[PDB]
Structure formats: structure tokens, C-alpha cells
């Protein structure tokens, strides 16, 4: 079966809103999401229905930018650095279970130079 997706809620972390959360929010996550290649990694990899059923025994540390989404509408983050952690850690997996020239690399790929792009300024 599939695992229970990473939460997106937690009473006893302490949340902040900050300007450059807001703007990853608004800006970063809101425009990649729209990007042809967003659709794979816009919820939890589905192993089941995909027929990888060894995905979730090589990734230990699951991100997508679904929880990503909810997360940063939760308040869920401190600071920018634990959401730009959690993007990391998404493409992160994607490079580790897939193999380069794969399709779905070569969209992680695409996706996270847009990433870089639009998180090398942000706002003060
Ligand atoms: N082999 C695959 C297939 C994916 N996919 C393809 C279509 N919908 C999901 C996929 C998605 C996100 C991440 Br992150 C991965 O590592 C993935 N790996």
C-alpha cells in the first residue's frame, strides 16, 4: 500500500508568516504549479496506482508539491529555508529512485531550474 502522506499540520510546531514564505507561496509554488511538466508532483507518489511498488521502500522521505501547497496555506513553516528544504527534498527523490534521461527526471529537471530561478531573489 501507499504510506501516510507527510503531514501538513502540527499544533506544537511553532508557524511564522514571513514575507518570502508568503511569496513562495504566491509567487514560486503558485507559477511552477502551472508548468506542463507540474502535474507528476503536484500530490504524494501514488505506488499503487502507478505500479511502483517499490518506490516507497528506496524513498524514505516522501515531499511533493501538493503537501508543499498545504502546507505553506497551513502556516506550517518557521522560515523560507524549511520550505526550499522541502522542494529539495522532492526533487532530491526524484533524482534517487528514477535514472537521468528518464522522463520524469528530465520534468524534475525543468522544474527545479525554474525553482532556483525564482527563489535566487526574494523579497526582503
Ligand atoms: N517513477 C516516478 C514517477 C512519478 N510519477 C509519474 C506520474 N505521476 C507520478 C514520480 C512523481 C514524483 C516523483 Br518526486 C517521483 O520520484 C516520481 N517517480
Redesign the pocket.
Known amino acids: 500500500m501507499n504510506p501516510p502522506p507527510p503531514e501538513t499540520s502540527n499544533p506544537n510546531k511553532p508557524k511564522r508568516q514571513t514575507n518570502q514564505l508568503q511569496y513562495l507561496l504566491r509567487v514560486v509554488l503558485k507559477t511552477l504549479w502551472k508548468h506542463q511538466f507540474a502535474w507528476?508532483?503536484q500530490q504524494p507518489?501514488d505506488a499503487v496506482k502507478?505500479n511502483?511498488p517499490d518506490?516507497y521502500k528506496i524513498?524514505k522521505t516522501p515531499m511533493?508539491m501538493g503537501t508543499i501547497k498545504k502546507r505553506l496555506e497551513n502556516n506550517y513553516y518557521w522560515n523560507a529555508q524549511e520550505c526550499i528544504q522541502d522542494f529539495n527534498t522532492?526533487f532530491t527523490?526524484?533524482y534517487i529512485?528514477?535514472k537521468p534521461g528518464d522522463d520524469?527526471v528530465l520534468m524534475?529537471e525543468a522544474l527545479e531550474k525554474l525553482f532556483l530561478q525564482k527563489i535566487n531573489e526574494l523579497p526582503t
Do not use: G
Open positions: 507528476p508532483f507518489v502507478l511502483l518506490y524513498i511533493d522532492m527523490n526524484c529512485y528514477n520524469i524534475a
